[PDB]
Amino acid sequence: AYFYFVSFIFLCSFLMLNLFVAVIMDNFEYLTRDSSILGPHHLDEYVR
Amino acid sequence: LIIIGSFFMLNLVLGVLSGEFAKERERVENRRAFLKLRRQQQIERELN
Amino acid sequence: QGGVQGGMVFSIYFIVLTLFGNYTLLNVFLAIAVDNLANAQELTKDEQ
Amino acid sequence: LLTLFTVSTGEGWPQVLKHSVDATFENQGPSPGYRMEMSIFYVVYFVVF
Amino acid sequence: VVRKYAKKITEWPPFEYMILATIIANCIVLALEQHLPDDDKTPMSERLDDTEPYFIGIFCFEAGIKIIALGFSYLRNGWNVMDFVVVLTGILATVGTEFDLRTLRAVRVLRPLKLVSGIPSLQVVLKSIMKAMIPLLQIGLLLFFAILIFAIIGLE
Amino acid sequence: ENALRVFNIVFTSLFSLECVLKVMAFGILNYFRDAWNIFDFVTVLGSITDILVTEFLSFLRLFRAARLIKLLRQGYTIRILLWTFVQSFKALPYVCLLIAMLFFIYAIIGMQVFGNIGIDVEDEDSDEDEFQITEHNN
Amino acid sequence: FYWTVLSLVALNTLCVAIVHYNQPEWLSDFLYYAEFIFLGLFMSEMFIKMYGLGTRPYFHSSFNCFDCGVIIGSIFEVIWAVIKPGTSFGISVLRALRLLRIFKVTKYWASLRNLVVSLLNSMKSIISLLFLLFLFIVVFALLG
Amino acid sequence: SIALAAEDPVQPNAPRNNVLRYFDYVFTGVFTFEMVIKMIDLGLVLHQGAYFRDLWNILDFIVVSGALVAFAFTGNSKGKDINTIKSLRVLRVLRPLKTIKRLPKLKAVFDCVVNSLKNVFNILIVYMLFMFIFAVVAVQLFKG
Amino acid sequence: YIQGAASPKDMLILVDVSGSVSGLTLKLIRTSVSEMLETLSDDDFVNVASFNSNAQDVSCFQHLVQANVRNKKVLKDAVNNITAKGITDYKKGFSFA
Numbered sequence: 001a002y003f004y005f006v007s008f009i010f011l012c013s014f015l016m017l018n019l020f021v022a023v024i025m026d027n028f029e030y031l032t033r034d035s036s037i038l039g040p041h042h043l044d045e046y047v048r
Numbered sequence: 049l050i051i052i053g054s055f056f057m058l059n060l061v062l063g064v065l066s067g068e069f070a071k072e073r074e075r076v077e078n079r080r081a082f083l084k085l086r087r088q089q090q091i092e093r094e095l096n
Numbered sequence: 097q098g099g100v101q102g103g104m105v106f107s108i109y110f111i112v113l114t115l116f117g118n119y120t121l122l123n124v125f126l127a128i129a130v131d132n133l134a135n136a137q138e139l140t141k142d143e144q
Numbered sequence: 145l146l147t148l149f150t151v152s153t154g155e156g157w158p159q160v161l162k163h164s165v166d167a168t169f170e171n172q173g174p175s176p177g178y179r180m181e182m183s184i185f186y187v188v189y190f191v192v193f
Numbered sequence: 194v195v196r197k198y199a200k201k202i203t204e205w206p207p208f209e210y211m212i213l214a215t216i217i218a219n220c221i222v223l224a225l226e227q228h229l230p231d232d233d234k235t236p237m238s239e240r241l242d243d244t245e246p247y248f249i250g251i252f253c254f255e256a257g258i259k260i261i262a263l264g265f266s267y268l269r270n271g272w273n274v275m276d277f278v279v280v281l282t283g284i285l286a287t288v289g290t291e292f293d294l295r296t297l298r299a300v301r302v303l304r305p306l307k308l309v310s311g312i313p314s315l316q317v318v319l320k321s322i323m324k325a326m327i328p329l330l331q332i333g334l335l336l337f338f339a340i341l342i343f344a345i346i347g348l349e
Numbered sequence: 350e351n352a353l354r355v356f357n358i359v360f361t362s363l364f365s366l367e368c369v370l371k372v373m374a375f376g377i378l379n380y381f382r383d384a385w386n387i388f389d390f391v392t393v394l395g396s397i398t399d400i401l402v403t404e405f406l407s408f409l410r411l412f413r414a415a416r417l418i419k420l421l422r423q424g425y426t427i428r429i430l431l432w433t434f435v436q437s438f439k440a441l442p443y444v445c446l447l448i449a450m451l452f453f454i455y456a457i458i459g460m461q462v463f464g465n466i467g468i469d470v471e472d473e474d475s476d477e478d479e480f481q482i483t484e485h486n487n
Numbered sequence: 488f489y490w491t492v493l494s495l496v497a498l499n500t501l502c503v504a505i506v507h508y509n510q511p512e513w514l515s516d517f518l519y520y521a522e523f524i525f526l527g528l529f530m531s532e533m534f535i536k537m538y539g540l541g542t543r544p545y546f547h548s549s550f551n552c553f554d555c556g557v558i559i560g561s562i563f564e565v566i567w568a569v570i571k572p573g574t575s576f577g578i579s580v581l582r583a584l585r586l587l588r589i590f591k592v593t594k595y596w597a598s599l600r601n602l603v604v605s606l607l608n609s610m611k612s613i614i615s616l617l618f619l620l621f622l623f624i625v626v627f628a629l630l631g
Numbered sequence: 632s633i634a635l636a637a638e639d640p641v642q643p644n645a646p647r648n649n650v651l652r653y654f655d656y657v658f659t660g661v662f663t664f665e666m667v668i669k670m671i672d673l674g675l676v677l678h679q680g681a682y683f684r685d686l687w688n689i690l691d692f693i694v695v696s697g698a699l700v701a702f703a704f705t706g707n708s709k710g711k712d713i714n715t716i717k718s719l720r721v722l723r724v725l726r727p728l729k730t731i732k733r734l735p736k737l738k739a740v741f742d743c744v745v746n747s748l749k750n751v752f753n754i755l756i757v758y759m760l761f762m763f764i765f766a767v768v769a770v771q772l773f774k775g
Numbered sequence: 776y777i778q779g780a781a782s783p784k785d786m787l788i789l790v791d792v793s794g795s796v797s798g799l800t801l802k803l804i805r806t807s808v809s810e811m812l813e814t815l816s817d818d819d820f821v822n823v824a825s826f827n828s829n830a831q832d833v834s835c836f837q838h839l840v841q842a843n844v845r846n847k848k849v850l851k852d853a854v855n856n857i858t859a860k861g862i863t864d865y866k867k868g869f870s871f872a
């Protein structure tokens with residue numbers, strides 16, 4: 001039970017963290033966007 | 049409730065903060081401090 | 097402060113403390129880690 | 145290391161802190177609030193890890 | 194709100210250091226207080242409590258110097274506004290007791306924050322922290338909506 | 350309780366008119382090509398269902414509780430931020446699968462090793478910290 | 488010399504880890520004397536560098552100053568034990584931080600050294616950040 | 632994998648476990664057949680295409696070998712040694728991991744996780760050294 | 776045993792009822808005072824007083840009463856109905872005792 005729970009907390013936190021960075025770093029262009037420079041988010045304003 | 053409320057919001061908070069920190073690094077005043085740091089290190093290597 | 101009958105307005109002290117404290121700690125320590133590690137990566141790449 | 149790992153995950157450390165401040169001497173029982181300066185150990189531990 | 198310019202005298206470096214010292218002393222005095230149940234006081238409580246006139250007088254004096262020198266650009270700075278309300282609430286409780294004024298003592302907790310106003314270096318660092326959490330407010334709006342929706346569902 | 354229930358009948362009527370009004374204006378087919386329109390249509394159909402049964406449980410009216418989401422479209426920066434992150438979770442399905450396997454492997458190991466522990470044990474001592482393997486947690 | 492003193496630190500790090508609640512009496516006697524032996528060797532290692540490299544070159548080195556602090560701290564503990572028996576802080580374990588110098592032989596030294604270089608560069612900012620964080624705790628503590 | 636999830640832990644002699652036991656024979660049989668042909672197509676000896684060279688092949692080898700050995704102990708006498716056979720039955724939980732190698736995109740995600748461990752390994756060693764120092768100090772303070 | 780272990784007493788219990796004894800300490804004080812009253816014979820005289828800032832008698836008794844089975848009941852009932860509020864003044868409670 002010592003190894004069962006101690007390893008789980010490490011592995012669960014590590015695998016969840018890799019999920020977070022994968023989702024974050026997929027949208028990293030949007031998160032570091034600047035309103036001055038053109039971006040894909042702006043182009044939807046052209047459509048309406 | 050836990051997945052949406054706690055794990056999904058934590059993902060956005062890390063995502064938004066990380067994007068802000070990337071933009072802050074490339075600020076003109078912040079870049080100049082790093083350029084001073086790089087030059088000061090180059091002197092130390094040659095001086096040694 | 098009374099009980100459930102009269103002291104329910106005092107939960108705001110605890111809500112504000114844990115809500116602000118949770119993300120203030122994240123902001124302070126993650127900014128320290130990101131900025132200093134990003135400096136080290138650029139500083140290492142430049143010397144190579 | 146197992147006790148500190150439990151504190152790192154954040155669960156149950158208030159009880160570990162209570163036992164730490166109440167400790168008196170080797171092979172002797174606890175006394176409430178004996179060593180209240182041992183709180184510095186857990187505050188410094190949280191800052192680092 | 195002054196008599197225009199008439200021998201207006203400004204500050205000199207030891208002045209703000211004396212203000213800093215009195216703020217630190219006030220913080221220590223606040224940290225030395227013990228609260229006991231049901232209208233019970235410790236012997237040191239009276240000695241600590243009688244020091245309040247001195248601190249409030251010093252703070253009122255420095256606020257007066259700044260307000261006459263600047264001319265009431267005093268309230269332009271956000272830090273001075275926080276200083277002004279600290280002085281105002283103190284005088285109401287300290288001078289006169291006819292109204293219920295035990296609640297106004299709670300405003301004294303903000304006095305340690307005057308360290309940030311006094312030391313300009315801390316202001317720059319404090320600006321950095323608040324700047325990053327401006328985007329995070331939009332996350333809080335998502336969080337509140339999520340809590341509201343799940344509260345309705347839990348209510349049903 | 351009756352007054353609250355009466356207001357439900359008033360709203361579910363008006364919310365049914367919007368669907369009727371849009372369908373005629375947009376057309377049978379074009380209207381049914383927008384995700385919100387079906388979401389709106391299933392919501393009105395679910396709520397109207399329960400009302401007739403009462404005179405002739407309504408947890409599917411909590412779909413109506415989801416109507417508040419429509420207010421998000423007015424706030425732009427929230428809508429883009431919420432939508433982009435949701436799309437990213439769809440583009441990373443196998444990363445979620447790896448977490449599911451970790452729970453699977455650690456669940457099977459737990460059943461075989463720690464499954465036999467008894468839970469019926471209870472005593473006046475009731476050292477709750479001592480015994481955390483109970484009817485709910487096992 | 489560099490590898491030999493480093494191997495001594497590994498022995499000293501091992502010695503302070505053996506201690507447990509009921510250790511046999513022979514173990515306590517061995518460890519009691521071994522601390523003085525290790526302390527003596529590292530103080531001598533201090534003096535050899537001091538005379539070998541000169542007092543000014545030795546002290547100006549950042550690494551050697553850290554060795555001074557643990558050496559001075561170790562002396563403080565032993566005298567403290569006699570005056571007030573019952574309390575031991577194990578200050579000698581801080582000598583184990585010298586094991587991080589092993590990273591020099593690997594390719595990973597540049598990444599690790601640069602991180603410490605950048606941390607020391609912004610030491611003023613980090614200290615101010617912790618102070619402001621401490622101030623808000625005090626305000627909330629006073630409000631409570 | 633689904634069979635391992637249906638099994639009743641509380642009742643060793645449950646009717647469900649009796650039925651599922653027959654299924655365990657078939658699944659091992661399939662894994663035995665694929666093992667030998669993989670040894671036949673490749674080579675056991677280390678000729679740079681060795682079957683034992685690939686790490687997952689050892690993982691496949693362990694699952695099938697444990698199942699076969701568990702049968703041998705049960706074969707002689709059903710309940711002569713319940714402890715070790717119960718331990719060997721636990722190795723079946725490695726069956727889901729056999730999916731990672733075969734699925735291309737699941738292997739790719741797995742390599743990314745291992746890649747992240749490599750980057751943070753150097754800091755992880757520093758983390759444990761610092762945590763070791765705190766543990767030794769904590770022992771001296773609160774031992775006994 | 777109590778009869779043979781000592782001589783008749785003139786006991787005056789002085790109970791502190793300032794604010795700081797509020798909560799658990801008050802329950803322990805009342806239980807302790809009752810248990811002390813149980814160790815008194817009819818040859819013993821007892822009176823219970825209390826003081827936060829001015830001393831007063833807890834019950835109707837004003838001077839000293841022998842520890843009957845009924846005087847003791849009156850004192851116990853009076854003790855079980857005291858509340859903690861004020862600032863301790865030892866020089867006014869001891870001057871009363």
Ligand SMILES: CC(C)CCC[C@@H](C)[C@H]1CC[C@H]2[C@@H]3CC=C4C[C@@H](OC(=O)CCC(=O)O)CC[C@]4(C)[C@H]3CC[C@]12C
Nearest residue numbers: 177178179180181182183184187191617618620621624
């Ligand atoms: C984010 C970080 C930088 C802030 C952490 C706050 C610390 C500066 C505080 C939190 C707990 C405090 C400790 C809590 C308890 C005590 C015991 C107390 O010392 C006594 O002997 C008092 C006797 C008693 O209280 O019975 C006062 C100092 C000390 C070590 C305090 C010192 C200041 C500490 C470490």
Ligand SMILES: CC(C)CCC[C@@H](C)[C@H]1CC[C@H]2[C@@H]3CC=C4C[C@@H](OC(=O)CCC(=O)O)CC[C@]4(C)[C@H]3CC[C@]12C
Nearest residue numbers: 497500501502503504505506507508509510511512763
């Ligand atoms: C830097 C690292 C690699 C150092 C080596 C690890 C040590 C910190 C650990 C590893 C195993 C530990 C040991 C595991 C178990 C025991 C048995 C324990 O003895 C008893 O339980 C009873 C002794 C008796 O009654 O005689 C004493 C401590 C000791 C040696 C431990 C001391 C600390 C040890 C050596």
Ligand SMILES: CC(C)CCC[C@@H](C)[C@H]1CC[C@H]2[C@@H]3CC=C4C[C@@H](OC(=O)CCC(=O)O)CC[C@]4(C)[C@H]3CC[C@]12C
Nearest residue numbers: 449452453632633634635636637638639645646647648
């Ligand atoms: C999520 C993925 C991995 C698939 C889900 C797997 C398990 C969560 C499911 C699959 C088959 C299910 C089992 C199918 C049939 C039964 C019998 C059913 O009947 C009984 O009460 C026991 C039989 C008896 O009393 O004799 C109890 C639930 C159980 C064990 C089910 C428990 C949940 C199981 C193991």
Ligand SMILES: CC(C)CCC[C@@H](C)[C@H]1CC[C@H]2[C@@H]3CC=C4C[C@@H](O)CC[C@]4(C)[C@H]3CC[C@]12C
Nearest residue numbers: 009010011013014117118119121122152153154
């Ligand atoms: C895997 C090992 C290292 C520990 C497991 C990680 C989890 C359980 C631990 C490690 C780091 C911890 C968090 C680190 C950051 C903070 C600071 C503040 O925001 C709230 C506390 C909080 C949230 C800690 C709570 C629990 C925490 C998330």
Ligand SMILES: CC(C)CCC[C@@H](C)[C@H]1CC[C@H]2[C@@H]3CC=C4C[C@@H](O)CC[C@]4(C)[C@H]3CC[C@]12C
Nearest residue numbers: 181182183184185188192576581764765768772
């Ligand atoms: C950063 C690395 C070097 C970690 C080493 C620092 C740690 C181990 C030190 C720093 C401050 C220290 C504390 C300072 C003061 C006291 C009070 C004393 O009566 C008991 C020990 C105790 C509670 C110390 C325990 C050890 C301690 C927490």
Ligand SMILES: CC(C)CCC[C@@H](C)[C@H]1CC[C@H]2[C@@H]3CC=C4C[C@@H](O)CC[C@]4(C)[C@H]3CC[C@]12C
Nearest residue numbers: 633634635637638645646647648649650651654
């Ligand atoms: C091959 C995969 C699908 C494994 C699935 C096996 C599952 C679905 C089957 C196999 C054996 C089956 C069990 C066999 C034994 C019993 C006891 C019987 O009195 C009731 C049904 C019950 C409880 C069956 C439930 C379903 C069951 C568990």
Ligand SMILES: [Ca+2]
Nearest residue numbers: 793794795863
């Ligand atoms: Ca008192």
